[PDB]
Amino acid sequence: DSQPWTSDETVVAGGTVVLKCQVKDHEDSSLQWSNPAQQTLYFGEKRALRDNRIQLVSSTPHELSISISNVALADEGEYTCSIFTMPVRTAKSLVTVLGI
Amino acid sequence: QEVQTEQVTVAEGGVAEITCRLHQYDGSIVVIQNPARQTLFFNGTRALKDERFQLEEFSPRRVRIRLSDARLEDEGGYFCQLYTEDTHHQIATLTVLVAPENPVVEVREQAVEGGEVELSCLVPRSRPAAVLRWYRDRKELKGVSSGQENGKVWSVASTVRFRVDRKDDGGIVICEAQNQALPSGHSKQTQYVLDVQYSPTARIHASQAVVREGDTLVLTCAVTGNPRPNQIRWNRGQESLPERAEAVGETLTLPGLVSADQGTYTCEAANKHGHARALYVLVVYDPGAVVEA
Amino acid sequence: LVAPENPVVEVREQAVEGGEVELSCLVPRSRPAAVLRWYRDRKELKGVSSGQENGKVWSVASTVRFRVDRKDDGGIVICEAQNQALPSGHSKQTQYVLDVQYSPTARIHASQAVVREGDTLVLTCAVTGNPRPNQIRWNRGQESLPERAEAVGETLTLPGLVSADQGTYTCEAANKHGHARALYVLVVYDPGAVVE
Numbered sequence: 262d263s264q265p266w267t268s269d270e271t272v273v274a275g276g277t278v279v280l281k282c283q284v285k286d287h288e289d290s291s292l293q294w295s296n297p298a299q300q301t302l303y304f305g306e307k308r309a310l311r312d313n314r315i316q317l318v319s320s321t322p323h324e325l326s327i328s329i330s331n332v333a334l335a336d337e338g339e340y341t342c343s344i345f346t347m348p349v350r351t352a353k354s355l356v357t358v359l360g361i
Numbered sequence: 362q363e364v365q366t367e368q369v370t371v372a373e374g375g376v377a378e379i380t381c382r383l384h385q386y387d388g389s390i391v392v393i394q395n396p397a398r399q400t401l402f403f404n405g406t407r408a409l410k411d412e413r414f415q416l417e418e419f420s421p422r423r424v425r426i427r428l429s430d431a432r433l434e435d436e437g438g439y440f441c442q443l444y445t446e447d448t449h450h451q452i453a454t455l456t457v458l459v460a461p462e463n464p465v466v467e468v469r470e471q472a473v474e475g476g477e478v479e480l481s482c483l484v485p486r487s488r489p490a491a492v493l494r495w496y497r498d499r500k501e502l503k504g505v506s507s508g509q510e511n512g513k514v515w516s517v518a519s520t521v522r523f524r525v526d527r528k529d530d531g532g533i534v535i536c537e538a539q540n541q542a543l544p545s546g547h548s549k550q551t552q553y554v555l556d557v558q559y560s561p562t563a564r565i566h567a568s569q570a571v572v573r574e575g576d577t578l579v580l581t582c583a584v585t586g587n588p589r590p591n592q593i594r595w596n597r598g599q600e601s602l603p604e605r606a607e608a609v610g611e612t613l614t615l616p617g618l619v620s621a622d623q624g625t626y627t628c629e630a631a632n633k634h635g636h637a638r639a640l641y642v643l644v645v646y647d648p649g650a651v652v653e654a
Numbered sequence: 655l656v657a658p659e660n661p662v663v664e665v666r667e668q669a670v671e672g673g674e675v676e677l678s679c680l681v682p683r684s685r686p687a688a689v690l691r692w693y694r695d696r697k698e699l700k701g702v703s704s705g706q707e708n709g710k711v712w713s714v715a716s717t718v719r720f721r722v723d724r725k726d727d728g729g730i731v732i733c734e735a736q737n738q739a740l741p742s743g744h745s746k747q748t749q750y751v752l753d754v755q756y757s758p759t760a761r762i763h764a765s766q767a768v769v770r771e772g773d774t775l776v777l778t779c780a781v782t783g784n785p786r787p788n789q790i791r792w793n794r795g796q797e798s799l800p801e802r803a804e805a806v807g808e809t810l811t812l813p814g815l816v817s818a819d820q821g822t823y824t825c826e827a828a829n830k831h832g833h834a835r836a837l838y839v840l841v842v843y844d845p846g847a848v849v850e
């Protein structure tokens with residue numbers, strides 16, 4: 262019920278993917294995105310991993326939305342939305358890249 | 362991309378500190394993740410609703426967090442991710458230790474004299490596996506040890522056998538156990554007090570060394586035995602005890618002795634391992650004329 | 655202190671696809687007791703240790719038992735013995751290479767996609783299996799192979815194909831766990847005959 266849901270996106274290589282993750286009952290925990298390498302991207306509206314393509318699109322208590330510009334084949338895979346309630350509930354998004 | 366890994370140990374239930382050396386600090390985001398890659402602290406902010414983790418020092422030199430109430434489910438790589446370009450990891454691998462629990466000594470079957478004793482000793486939780494040594498009256502006994510790993514922890518056992526007479530009863534046997542979670546040359550110990558059964562022995566001691574007519578004598582039967590014997594029977598050969606004799610428990614009370622109350626009296630006691638009998642030759646002295654010495 | 659030499663890894667019973675394999679890893683001497691870890695290529699496998707102090711030293715030993723299918727054949731397994739008599743992060747590792755058996759399979763490759771009369775055709779019967787099947791048996795129904803056909807091992811050469819060498823040829827091979835057969839249909843086209 263307070264579990265985040267995200268939908269897989271799919272992008273032509275070189276494009277910008279928009280990853281979106283939202284929560285109905287946030288139980289006063291922050292969301293976060295990690296990349297397929299368990300490496301933190303955005304925790305709330307605070308940027309973590311210093312990459313320039315990766316940019317923030319929304320940070321309201323109920324949604325975390327980021328955009329990875331100029332996508333490349335090495336940006337495919339499972340991005341983990343985490344909400345830091347107890348227990349920590351996760352939601353995965355599978356980026357697929359078109360072109361080569 | 363660089364990865365450096367220190368090592369870090371706890372005694373179970375204990376408290377561990379994780380220092381994240383940072384060489385020179387610009388100010389960039391610092392994340393810490395449990396081994397499930399779940400972020401404890403994104404920079405200062407707590408981000409796992411588990412309050413055993415507290416944040417101590419965040420100083421241009423290092424970051425330090427503390428896990429209180431360590432469990433075996435808290436081992437693994439603790440990631441310290443410093444987010445600059447490029448990123449730099451510090452992985453502190455936590456190893457949690459169970460110091461051996463108090464040894465438990467049991468005897469297989471009852472120690473009987475002449476027979477043998479089978480003593481065992483079991484640490485049920487050790488990490489690393491323990492070492493069981495046996496000591497008896499400050500010498501070491503040689504055992505037959507062998508463990509088994511029920512998860513991350515070890516139950517070890519060690520079973521010594523030796524021979525016992527009645528001296529050995531009441532005697533102390535020490536099982537001590539030690540491993541790494543305990544200072545070098547320390548140990549937990551457990552002392553088992555032997556219990557050897559033995560066939561009884563009786564012996565009579567008298568109230569007076571010289572018994573004269575019209576005295577009251579009390580004989581006493583000085584039994585030993587394991588089990589101790591619970592009944593004593595008093596006898597005067599094929600003859601009745603003096604009337605007025607009081608055979609009560611472990612004492613015969615002869616009062617108003619008269620020269621016909623002479624004879625050899627016996628006390629007789631037994632347990633499950635044997636019998637015993639002792640024998641007092643009663644002699645009532647008089648002012649009459651005696652054969653010469 | 656005593657350091658653990660290289661783990662001795664044995665297998666009790668020959669493994670077999672569909673079934674299970676049980677590995678035993680032995681360190682006859684270590685003081686302290688060596689910590690035995692199983693690793694399957696990258697990941698970590700869970701075993702069950704059980705030692706016995708013979709004096710000052712121990713003979714620790716662990717055992718893991720998982721399922722195997724043909725794909726795991728010749729696969730790679732690692733037993734990793736720690737200790738205190740060993741430097742930090744180091745270990746005495748040892749590799750085992752599975753030996754899973756399975757039912758053979760057969761599949762026929764030709765040397766040539768269209769046959770016209772007079773040609774010569776080599777049929778390769780590409781067989782897998784463990785143990786390798788020792789006999790590739792070529793056959794053509796209840797009938798007989800062409801006169802000059804020579805089955806040399808796992809090929810079947812058919813020289814100078816006349817139009818009466820047609821119909822289905824099968825190679826056959828098997829080992830103790832199973833049997834496979836593959837089937838090829840020879841059409842010997844006359845020259846000047848559209849084939850598509």
Ligand SMILES: *[C@@H]1O[C@H](CO[C@@H]2O[C@@H](C)[C@@H](O)[C@@H](O)[C@@H]2O)[C@@H](O[C@@H]2O[C@H](CO)[C@@H](O)[C@H](O)[C@H]2NC(C)=O)[C@H](O)[C@H]1NC(C)=O
Pocket residue numbers: 388389390391404405406419420421
């Ligand atoms: C992220 O790292 C620290 C965050 O810690 C803050 O300071 C702690 C001491 C404590 O107060 C926490 O609750 C805070 O969130 C930031 O620290 C600044 O830099 C140092 C601390 O090492 C000290 O110079 C400053 O006073 C701190 N001031 C501010 C305004 O943060 C650091 O700047 C953060 N970096 C980013 C990129 O967010």
